[PDB]
């Protein structure tokens, strides 16, 4: 159970790195809304950032959150340096995707998926 760390020796350094990545994304959202000339608000983009951070909020392994911070830094570098187009930014907003049936009864009505 002795594993080689990526960056963080424990979870507190890991939470420090998660926190600095969230600060950098939070600062980046108005510039991303502006220069990609998006149709969303700055508040809605910061909501999407908060949603994507809370999506991974159950991880207890320091190496897994180190890789999550590394991949978030990579997505941030692809956003700041304008390497993504507008479409890659707007793929976080699943807008053309119709909303899926969530309860039992509508999933029963549409088909066979549990």
């Amino acid at each position: 159970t002795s594993v080689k760390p990526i960056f963080s020796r424990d979870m507190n350094e890991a939470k420090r790195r998660v926190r600095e990545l969230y600060r950098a994304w939070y600062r980046e959202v108005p510039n991303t809304v502006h220069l990609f000339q998006l149709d969303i608000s700055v508040k809605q983009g910061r909501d999407k950032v908060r949603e994507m951070f809370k999506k991974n909020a159950h991880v207890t392994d320091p190496r897994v959150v180190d890789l999550l911070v590394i991949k978030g830094k990579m997505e941030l570098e692809e956003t700041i340096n304008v390497w993504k187009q507008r479409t890659h930014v707007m793929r976080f907003f699943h807008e053309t995707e119709a909303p899926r049936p969530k309860d039992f009864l509508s999933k029963f009505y549409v088909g066979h998926d549990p």
Binding site: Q37, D39, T96, A98, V110, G111, D113
Partner: protein, 297 residues
């Protein structure tokens, strides 16, 4: 229900929605987004087109292979209408001109052709028929548009008694002639009150009217959530678009107030949240750039 028209899949491009739709007037502003939202479910869409086939090219990426069937039709040819609708389980009418022409006036476009489509769709056995009138339709209206559209609504209702008739108020979108009219006029300010409605709200309402069996025979009124005076709406259009072809009938329609019909169902009764103008007007008027929002009543 036939086995080939049972819905399958997960509602995507390669799926089967079980909707076989003949959409007349599909090459216009509403037909664009209606065929986009039908073909993204996996619906068979018959597009009868009058125009050049080049002018239908933008409708081709909108669905999977064989899911959009283009065919010729004439408005004064019932045989082409029967040729287009006889396999469909829903027929949507979107035929409209803002202006009258030499070969087609407002009565041909709004009375003769919708009654022809609804009569042929009745005598072909089509289940569902959706017709699009205007919210300001009235026999005693000052404009010829709204008079002929009220007459055509009455004739559609009497020759297809289970027709879903839909009243949009003033549809705004990227290819509208409501915000793009005011943004390119650079006619005056009066006591006219309007609540414009967004085109994706209208399209979601039309597809929910297809899917709802309770929408047969209803008359819906698609309006926006916010009513505006005409003057501050035009000033908001000029403020967002960073600014300091018409006829007198269009002027009579811009100076006709959008009526309030609380006895008619609307977008909330089809499960559609009406999007306000303040989210989408920047998306529409970003093209017109080389803001405090408008006051609601």
């Amino acid at each position: 229900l036939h086995h080939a028209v049972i819905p399958h899949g997960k509602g995507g491009r390669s799926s089967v929605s079980g909707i076989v739709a003949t959409v007349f007037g599909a090459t216009g502003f509403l037909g664009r987004y209606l065929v986009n939202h039908l073909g993204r479910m996996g619906s068979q869409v018959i597009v009868p087109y009058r125009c050049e086939p080049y002018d239908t090219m933008h409708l081709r990426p909108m669905g999977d292979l064989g899911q959009i069937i283009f065919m010729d039709w004439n408005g004064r040819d019932k045989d082409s209408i029967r040729r287009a609708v006889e396999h469909s389980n829903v027929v949507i009418n979107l035929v409209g001109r803002e202006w009258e022409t030499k070969n087609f006036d407002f009565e041909d476009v709004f009375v003769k052709i919708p009654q022809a489509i609804a009569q042929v769709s009745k005598e072909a056995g089509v289940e569902k028929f959706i017709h699009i009138s205007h919210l300001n339709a009235d026999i005693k209206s000052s404009s010829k548009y709204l008079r002929n559209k009220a007459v055509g609504e009455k004739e559609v209702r009497e020759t297809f008694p289970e027709a879903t008739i839909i009243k949009p108020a003033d549809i705004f979108g990227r290819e509208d002639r409501f915000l793009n009219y005011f943004a390119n006029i650079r006619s005056l300010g009066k006591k006219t009150v309007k609540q414009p409605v967004y085109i994706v709200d209208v399209t979601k309402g039309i597809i929910n009217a297809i899917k709802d069996p309770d929408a047969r025979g209803k008359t819906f009124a698609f309006v926006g959530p916010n009513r505006y005076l005409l003057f501050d709406l035009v000033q908001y259009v000029f403020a967002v678009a960073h600014r300091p072809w018409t006829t007198r009938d269009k002027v009579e329609r811009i100076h006709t107030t959008d009526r309030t019909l609380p006895h008619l169902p609307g977008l909330e009764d089809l499960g559609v949240q009406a999007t306000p103008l303040e989210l989408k007007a920047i998306e529409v008027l970003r093209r017109h750039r080389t803001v405090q929002p408008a006051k609601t009543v």
